[PDB]
Amino acid sequence: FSEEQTAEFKEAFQLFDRTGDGKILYSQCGDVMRALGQNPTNAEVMKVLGNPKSDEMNLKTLKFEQFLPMMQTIAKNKDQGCFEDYVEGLRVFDKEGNGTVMGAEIRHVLVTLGEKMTEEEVEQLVAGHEDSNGCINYEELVRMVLSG
Amino acid sequence: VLALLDEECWFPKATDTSFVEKLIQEQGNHAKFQKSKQLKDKTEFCIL
């Protein structure tokens, strides 16, 4: 990364502290990273954190040359998707095959699959991209997730 | 530095960026060389 954007990252680190000495909680790693032009899966991060459970996930600490290498060690990346991948991967609620997507079910997948979203996380991604019957045009729901 | 930059001077795929990337690439671990204070973004190198 250039020193420029890394300075912005130095701040996005610096802000997020606890005892006042260059110390970020493991928890915050992916989220800060996400804002920093990245969407690293919890599974991706968990690899480069060393499999904590909720306890030491909440308790263990990062510092900057643990954070910034992690950022990088995901950032140069492998599979990360595009429109064509995500129209199929968001035709993912087509109910008959309809070019529009299932309202409750888009919420449920988000609770029910891998990286279990809260209710909160589910509703926010979905809401108001359905119609009266609760059909979501995914062809657009795709671009919404893929840019913003 | 100079030699990588002579080669890099004669080079289209080569950005002042990839000059410092080629310097990290070739030197790195040398007991007289040092990277930037994380400023890859500014692309700079600290040397003994």
From Swiss-Prot, chain A:
What Gene3D superfamilies would the database entry show?
EF-hand
Q: Which Gene Ontology BP annotations are present?
A: actomyosin structure organization; myofibril assembly
Coiled-coil spans are none
Could you state a single Gene Ontology molecular function term? myosin heavy chain binding
Annotated keywords: Acetylation, Motor protein, Muscle protein, Myosin, Repeat
Note whether DNA repair occurs among the keywords. Answer: no
Task: Read off the InterPro entries from this record.
Answer: CALM/Myosin/TropC-like, EF-hand-dom_pair, EF_hand_dom
GO CC terms in record: actomyosin; cytosol; muscle myosin complex; myosin II complex; myosin II filament
Name all EF-hand domain ranges: 4-39, 81-116, 116-148
Q: What is the annotated signal peptide range for this record? A: none
- Known SMART domains for this protein? EFh
Subunit organization: Myosin is a hexamer of 2 heavy chains and 4 light chains.
The task this protein performs is described as: Regulatory light chain of myosin. Does not bind calcium.
**Protein's name in the database:** Myosin light polypeptide 6
Gene name for this UniProt entry: MYL6
Swiss-Prot record, chain B:
**Location in the cell:** Cytoplasm, Myofibril
User: What is known about what this protein does?
Assistant: Muscle contraction.
The record's family statement is: Belongs to the TRAFAC class myosin-kinesin ATPase superfamily. Myosin family.
Entry text on domains: The rodlike tail sequence is highly repetitive, showing cycles of a 28-residue repeat pattern composed of 4 heptapeptides, characteristic for alpha-helical coiled coils.
Oligomeric state and interaction partners are given as: Muscle myosin is a hexameric protein that consists of 2 heavy chain subunits (MHC), 2 alkali light chain subunits (MLC) and 2 regulatory light chain subunits (MLC-2).
Q: What's the protein here called? A: Myosin-11
Q: Report the source organism.
A: Gallus gallus (Chicken)
